[PDB]
């Protein structure tokens, strides 16, 4: 069992202080933004982080949502990052879910967070450059202390 508890609004950033947002195509991407850019690209810059209770607690269990035109929840299904249009549910009757992630702060830096996928043990939300884009993807860990799977969570 996973069950919903409270929510916070947040602005997510990567190792370069690039801001997470959802693009016209519903793709989570990263880009430099001034505070005025982060403010005026809302609601696509404002992520809902919802917390869940867990029967087998592995960290802080969470879902991640944005409100584009409708609400969309981040999924790890088939080892791929994507936005599914659904509301974070009151509860989830499984041990691993494509939409649950475990948030853990990074020892020595409380501002930094890693998000481990619950459906795939060992895999983490990450920032990758793909061609001219910067993308939020799922990846198994490369180096040890890999800065690309660490994020800051502000308002």
């Amino acid at each position: 069992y996973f069950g919903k508890l409270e929510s916070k609004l947040s602005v997510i950033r990567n190792l370069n202080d690039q801001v997470l947002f959802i693009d016209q195509g519903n793709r989570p991407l990263f880009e430099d933004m001034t505070d005025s850019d982060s403010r005026d690209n809302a609601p696509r810059t404002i992520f809902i982080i919802s917390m869940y209770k867990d029967s087998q607690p592995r960290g802080m269990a969470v879902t991640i949502s944005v409100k584009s035109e409708k609400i969309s929840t981040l999924s790890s299904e088939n080892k791929i990052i994507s936005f599914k249009e659904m509301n974070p549910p009151d509860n989830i009757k499984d041990t691993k879910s494509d939409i649950i992630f475990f948030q853990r702060s990074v020892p020595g830096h409380d501002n930094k967070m890693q998000f481990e996928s619950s459906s795939y043990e060992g895999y983490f939300l990450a920032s990758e450059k793909e061609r001219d884009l910067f993308k939020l993807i799922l990846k198994k860990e490369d180096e040890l202390g890999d800065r690309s799977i660490m994020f800051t969570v502000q308002n």
Binding site: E31, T34, D35, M51, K53, S55, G59, S105, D132, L133
Partner: protein, 275 residues
């Protein structure tokens, strides 16, 4: 790189570009304003080349939405140009915030991987006073606006490009690994007609969370938080089970504290009386 976000705010008087993230083929740039549907851009201060749209410099003239098309590709930008503070070195909307903990690694570095080959000079300001890098461990008084400025050569006159960081120096929290207080396994005595109230208690952080886990009417909850004389948050929560049947008997009721920094959980089993 390239410019992927739908909306963009820049300051008047400054060089600026728009790069469409797809890179002798057919390109087309278009502009919308109030009464201008899609004015195809064909400029004879604006330059169109190699899959980018340049402003030299950008102006209030230019606020409006922009569209790009390369056959199977299309893109849209709302461009909002803002007034520049002419009395100062930066303008308050164009600022990027940064949070850096007091006694900790802190850097600021002026760079541009686009306009770098045109740069002739690059000066760094602190609250508009000249000072290219600042490498340092943080002091409270490093709070301020650091402005990076870049002075550019372009076909007869001078341009500057300026980025500013609002640095806030933050105190560090005293963050605690949450602990539960008491035995990890617990046996509690009760009688079938009647009720039990299980108290669960923990040392945790402001942001931390304490909850019960049963199967999911004869159950209920509610929470309390008091500060210890050592400054820590003491939290507790009671789970009430009213008309106990045997269904309530050998099942583990887990209370948990869950933090971004760690977790602890403890189980309660309900027993009749004989032990």
């Amino acid at each position: 790189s390239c410019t992927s976000r739908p909306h963009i705010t820049v300051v008047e008087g400054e060089p600026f570009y728009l790069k469409h993230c797809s890179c002798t083929t057919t390109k087309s740039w278009y502009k919308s304003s109030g009464s201008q549907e899609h004015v195809e851009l064909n400029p004879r201060r604006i330059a169109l080349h190699d899959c980018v749209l340049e402003f030299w410099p950008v102006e209030l003239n230019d606020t409006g939405s922009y569209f790009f098309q390369m056959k199977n590709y299309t893109q849209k930008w709302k461009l909002n140009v803002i007034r520049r503070n002419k009395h100062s070195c930066f303008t308050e909307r164009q600022v990027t915030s940064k949070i850096v903990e007091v006694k900790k690694f802190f850097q600021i570095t002026c760079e541009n991987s686009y306009y770098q080959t045109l740069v002739n000079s690059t000066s760094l300001y602190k609250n508009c006073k000249k000072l290219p890098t600042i490498k340092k461990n943080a002091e409270f008084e490093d709070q301020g606006y650091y402005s990076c400025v870049h002075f550019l050569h372009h076909n007869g006159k001078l341009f500057n490009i300026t980025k500013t960081f609002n640095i806030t120096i933050v105190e560090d929290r005293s963050n605690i690994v949450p602990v539960l207080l008491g035995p990890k396994l617990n046996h509690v005595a009760v009688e079938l007609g009647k009720n039990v109230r299980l108290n669960c208690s923990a040392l945790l952080n402001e942001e931390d969370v304490i909850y019960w886990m049963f199967g999911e009417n004869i159950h209920e909850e509610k929470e309390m938080r008091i500060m210890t004389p050592e400054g820590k948050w003491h939290a507790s929560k009671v789970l009430r089970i009213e008309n106990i049947g045997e269904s309530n008997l050998n099942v583990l009721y887990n209370c948990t504290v869950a933090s971004t920094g760690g977790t602890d959980t403890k189980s309660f089993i309900l027993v009749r009386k004989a032990d």
